Write a protein that holds these residues in place. Structure first.
Motif: not given
Ligand SMILES: CCCCCCCCCCCCO[C@@H]1O[C@H](CO)[C@@H](O[C@H]2O[C@H](CO)[C@@H](O)[C@H](O)[C@H]2O)[C@H](O)[C@H]1O
Ligand SMILES: CCCCCCCCCCCCO[C@@H]1O[C@H](CO)[C@@H](O[C@H]2O[C@H](CO)[C@@H](O)[C@H](O)[C@H]2O)[C@H](O)[C@H]1O
Ligand SMILES: CCCCCCCCCCCCO[C@@H]1O[C@H](CO)[C@@H](O[C@H]2O[C@H](CO)[C@@H](O)[C@H](O)[C@H]2O)[C@H](O)[C@H]1O
Ligand SMILES: CCCCCCCCCCCCO[C@@H]1O[C@H](CO)[C@@H](O[C@H]2O[C@H](CO)[C@@H](O)[C@H](O)[C@H]2O)[C@H](O)[C@H]1O
Lengths: 383, 383
Positions: B84-85, B88-89, B156, B159
């Motif tokens: 999900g991160i 979105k990134t 982290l 990303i």
């Protein structure tokens, strides 16, 4: 037998808790849109943190599946497969049940079960695992026997669950909406007194991060003159909502009460240990005062003197009524230390009362702790 | 050391495989919109099955996380948080990298990594688990030590991975698009010859379900006169695309070749065992012929006579070229048995050639199996 299930509930919720603070830091630092930090970095942080919050129902489904199956990953897969089938089944059936067009359901969120549909999807996956993880099929289906059956039967059960939730959900979603309006606007004195007490009760376990989400990010609504819409006490206060700032009670016990309790723990240690204990308590009283992080003071007495923690949870609850009744408001973006108190002061009301009610909280916490520690011979640090 | 990693790759993909056939049955029975089955039941089945296909990237992220961490559920949670991160990134950074408006990226799917971004999100979660699942933090962070650190560091790292994929992805997504146009339209003879051979090679492991998705549901595009858009050989054939029906080679080996191989296995058993073996092979020859399910014939010789399976995989590959070159087309919705052959015959071409080329496949498979089983003394059923 209920205690062995409350362990499984706590264990299941500590997985969701473990990702809330990093998501809150990313969304907070990103959505602040600072001038000193570049535009793309701000947007990537905001959309990364917002992704973890948007995945909360699925994170809860996985936490409940793992917590009731002794951490088996096929239950986490079965919860992910169940959740997606159940959400899609409600989108088809809720229009039929409600007698409203599917675009009205989707745009007004009338069928949105939030984290509760996540918990149910995890409960399906956990039940189906513990009943079928050892299932024996005939040889023509032998490739799908045992654990491999669990995602399949969880998906089939997610259909029937989504049909039932389409009938059961409307009076539940309505009650959740009336609670939010009650807590924000109709009795904030009682609602935020219950929020402070229950938050303290969840801090020993780290479970307060889950309890804080609805009050900080979902209770009440504000639209500014630019037409931007804000939900929850923290966004609504920074947006300038005159009826925000219900969380301001935290300054009383985090800046004054707990720092005063730390000096009462220090002053009641045995003389041989009093110098060594002082540095722990000063360090811990400055951490609470500056930054509003309270565990190095709370965890110092919480287990060895639980009566002091029950009194603290009552006084921490009563702090939110006092601010709402006196009309003293101020914001938080991290926690109720001096940094948030000075930084968020622009939208504040009666800011000069926080020192005046704070010295009352300091006198009360200090005198309770000094008296009870001696009188009950509580084995606090240094005794 | 590579074999111990190919085991982990197979193990990681068998989790995704386990939910493909139920999703295909739900989406197939639902999207058919039958008159005898009610409207709401059809829509719920279609949206339930379509949900499992839409979750494929996340199901792959979980399968890769679990397959490389010995099935630990905190790696499945870390893969869900990472995926999900990362998605979105890419939505934030791909517009900047490409020099195109974010609505053009989103509407044309220019930044959509599909299952490959799922596999990468699982590889982050697995790496972060095996390096940090035992991490010791200082006591002020002790509540987040060990396994509880793994979702945080995976988020982290998601990303930085999403930033790198925004630069690396455009020449990869372009190559995936040119492969689809090559396989559908520029060299379908070579492409579907490779599809049949590799599918047979994955059947012993059950991995062919993953390989079948792109050719069945994603290769090529068709728009009908009503403006409905269809992707993959199966939807495009039922939609009436004149250039569909590339999968028709399956009728040759599933209706004729494998049934003939079953009688060659029966006729070469020892006389004491020949009557007992006959009923297994008849049963298995009728299952392949009627329904196109082939494992009860394949698994009868596959492990004890691997040379017969290599010859079969070559002849099953060559079946798809033969149909494309002769111009004989017919559809499947389940598998290439007599049921699909009669049911999907309306859009067909040169249907009378399937019997004629099929008796060739029967003569070839029968005579190969009878000769090689005697000559090599292969220990097939009844020997
Ligand atoms: C410990 C026992 C008691 C604890 C449980 C009692 C409280 C109930 C749990 C609260 C449920 C959290 O619910 C979850 O919150 C976040 C944040 O608001 C929502 O997140 C939503 O708003 C945030 C911004 O605030 C966006 O970044 C995100 O994209 C969005 O979808 C989730 O969509 C919602 O599903
Ligand atoms: C580490 C600093 C990172 C930069 C922070 C500044 C960015 C602005 C947004 C940050 C949002 C932080 O989010 C906020 O964190 C504080 C402190 O963790 C939490 O507050 C809670 O946590 C700590 C312990 O965990 C308790 O001692 C505290 O009493 C309790 O209130 C909140 O549930 C949340 O509202
Ligand atoms: C075994 C080793 C080799 C195997 C791997 C080689 C092939 C690569 C894997 C294929 C990837 C599957 O990719 C996945 O397919 C399904 C079905 O098409 C897509 O699904 C999409 O179309 C279906 C309908 O067909 C919809 O129901 C669904 O809502 C949609 O999003 C997924 O969105 C896509 O992510
Ligand atoms: C059990 C019957 C259920 C009703 C089926 C009719 C509904 C119409 C849609 C069904 C779609 C089925 O989807 C299709 O299934 C067949 C058979 O499993 C698979 O086909 C594969 O599976 C079996 C074993 O698993 C092999 O023997 C076969 O040779 C191979 O091609 C396909 O990869 C898929 O294309």
């Amino acid at each position: 037998n209920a205690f062995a299930n409350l362990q499984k509930v706590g264990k299941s919720l500590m997985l969701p808790v473990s990702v809330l603070p990093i998501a809150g830091i990313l969304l907070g630092v990103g959505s602040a849109n600072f001038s000193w930090l570049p535009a793309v970095v701000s947007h990537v942080m905001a959309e990364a943190g917002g992704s973890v919050f948007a995945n909360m129902p699925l994170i809860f489904a996985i936490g409940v599946a793992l917590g009731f199956t002794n951490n088996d990953g096929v239950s986490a897969l079965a919860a992910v497969v169940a959740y997606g089938i159940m959400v899609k089944t409600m989108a088809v059936v809720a229009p039929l049940v409600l007698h409203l067009p599917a675009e009205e359901i989707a745009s007004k969120h009338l069928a949105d079960t939030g984290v509760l549909g996540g918990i149910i999807s995890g409960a399906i996956a956990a039940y189906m695992f513990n009943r079928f993880y050892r299932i024996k099929l005939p040889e023509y289906l032998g490739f799908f026997a045992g654990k491999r059956f669990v995602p399949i039967i969880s998906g089939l059960a997610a259909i029937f669950t989504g049909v039932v939730l389409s009938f059961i959900w409307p009076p539940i979603g309505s009650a959740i909406q009336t609670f939010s309006q009650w807590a924000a606007y109709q009795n904030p004195v009682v609602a935020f007194g219950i929020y402070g007490f229950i938050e303290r009760c969840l801090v020993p376990f780290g479970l307060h991060h889950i309890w804080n989400v609805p009050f900080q990010m979902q209770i009440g609504e504000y639209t500014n003159a630019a037409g931007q819409v804000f939900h929850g006490d923290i966004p609504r206060y920074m947006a300038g909502d005159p009826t925000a700032g219900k969380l301001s009670g935290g300054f009383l016990f985090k800046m004054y009460g707990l720092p005063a309790a730390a000096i009462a723990i220090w002053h009641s240690a045995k003389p041989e240990n009093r110098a060594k204990v002082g540095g722990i308590m000063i360090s811990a009283a400055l951490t609470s005062f500056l930054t509003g992080i309270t565990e190095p003071i709370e965890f110092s007495f919480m287990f060895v003197a639980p009566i002091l923690y029950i009194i603290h949870a009552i006084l921490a609850g009563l702090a939110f009524p006092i601010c709402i009744l006196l009309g003293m408001r101020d914001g938080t973006s991290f926690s109720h230390g001096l940094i948030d108190f000075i930084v968020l002061s622009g939208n504040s009301s009666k800011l000069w009362l926080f020192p005046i009610v704070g010295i009352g909280y300091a006198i009360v916490y200090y005198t309770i702790f000094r008296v009870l520690i001696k009188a009950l011979d509580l084995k606090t640090p240094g005794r």
